[PDB]
Amino acid sequence: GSHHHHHHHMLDVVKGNLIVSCQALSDEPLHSSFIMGRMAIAAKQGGAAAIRAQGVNDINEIKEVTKLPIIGIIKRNYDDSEIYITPTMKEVDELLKTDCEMIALDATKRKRPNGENVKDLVDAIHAKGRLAMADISTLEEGIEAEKLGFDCVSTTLSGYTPYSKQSNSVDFELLEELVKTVKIPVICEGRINTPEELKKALDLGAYSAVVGGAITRPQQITKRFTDIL
Amino acid sequence: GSSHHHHHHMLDVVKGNLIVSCQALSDEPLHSSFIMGRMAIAAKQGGAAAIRAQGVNDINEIKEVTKLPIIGIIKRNYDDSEIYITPTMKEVDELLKTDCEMIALDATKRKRPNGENVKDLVDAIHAKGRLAMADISTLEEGIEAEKLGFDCVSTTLSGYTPYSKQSNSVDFELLEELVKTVKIPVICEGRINTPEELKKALDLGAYSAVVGGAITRPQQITKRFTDIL
Ligand SMILES: [Cl-]
Ligand SMILES: [Cl-]
Ligand SMILES: [Cl-]
Ligand SMILES: [Cl-]
């Protein structure tokens, strides 16, 4: 196969810049592709280089209304696994029907639904010429993700697996250690609340960083205000 | 002549608590009454005690979906005044057809459209049993606001009139001077970006405070992140 060549490529475009996660799941007040599209326009207008979004409907809306590069995921619970970020080939194939340039998945050590193997997911993503991002929780998971052929790794799941560091703040140590150790881009994602934390993540050698709720979850932002009173 | 009595009253409800301003004008990405309603629900769920909102459509939606106390305004440009926050009786009457418990208006020293005066607006608001908030820019405007019978004063316009302090951060100086001089509630509003600033406003004697864009304008929030890179 062949296709025409683009001047801009996603990893180059996000380097040194901000990615904004625009997510709102069914139990959140902004659950709506319409609203996530508007959040992404806001993000774009505020200088975001790319968007991370969940679900086919939100991804398609955001692409239409912003034309930004997208990291797409589908979050889905399975009865036979603890993994929920793009757990199986079913979600990969659903995502491949969208135009998102990168697909992120859980690349933890954990058993996937139906006994599926994360290498098969990465290979399917690459077979359609897309990029794969490994959402990890530990240093060793990042190492293995590079070995598996992921295009980049993200610290998304640190603090969201039982055996990873439990914290209410950014996991900067995992960031620094991944930067000591893997060659592929390391993206800092998880609990970035302040511009100072963002700048610190980049200063520590994050290739790029993702800010989510601190921009796109007004409930969370509001609670951070009311908590100090 | 009379009405049933309520247990909860707006000034008591906001005392020591957060008020969230949920506004998106026509040139802003979240412009939509539906969206502002969803933002207000998020704010409510994050602990906001009341909402400040703009326009009859957004006020009515927010009221319907949150049942929170509302500070209502209408922003409208007139060719014969610099004032745009609830400038004339026309806007006051439009607002009085909503259920908003408090109406805020520009209470600066500036000339209003059609040569109208602030006192007449306050009196009309009080004649329908509603509360009036004075958005001011200087200590002297706040002192006059109290004299005119406003129920409370807010520092909303400090730095948004040419004769007031020009600043890109909260005007704590004006807050402190007002608290020590006027007896009615003084509300801190304007450029509150961080929980630490909110806490400081209350610690300096603010009766309550209003946070807007730092919760409900994702473009502005995003720009504060990107500005640091
Ligand atoms: Cl995520
Ligand atoms: Cl939210
Ligand atoms: Cl306002
Ligand atoms: Cl915005």
Curated annotation (Swiss-Prot), chains A, B:
PANTHER family per UniProt: N-ACETYLMANNOSAMINE-6-PHOSPHATE 2-EPIMERASE-RELATED (PTHR36204:SF1)
Group of enzyme by EC: isomerase
Pfam name, any one: NanE
Name by which UniProt lists this protein: Putative N-acetylmannosamine-6-phosphate 2-epimerase
Keyword Chloroplast: no
Taxon lineage: Bacteria, Bacillati, Bacillota, Clostridia, Eubacteriales
MF (Gene Ontology): N-acylglucosamine-6-phosphate 2-epimerase activity
HAMAP family attached to this UniProt entry: ManNAc6P_epimer
Organism: Clostridium perfringens (strain ATCC 13124 / DSM 756 / JCM 1290 / NCIMB 6125 / NCTC 8237 / Type A)
Pathway participation: Amino-sugar metabolism; N-acetylneuraminate degradation; D-fructose 6-phosphate from N-acetylneuraminate: step 3/5
Gene Ontology CC terms, in alphabetical order: cytosol
GO terms under biological process: carbohydrate metabolic process; N-acetylmannosamine catabolic process; N-acetylneuraminate catabolic process
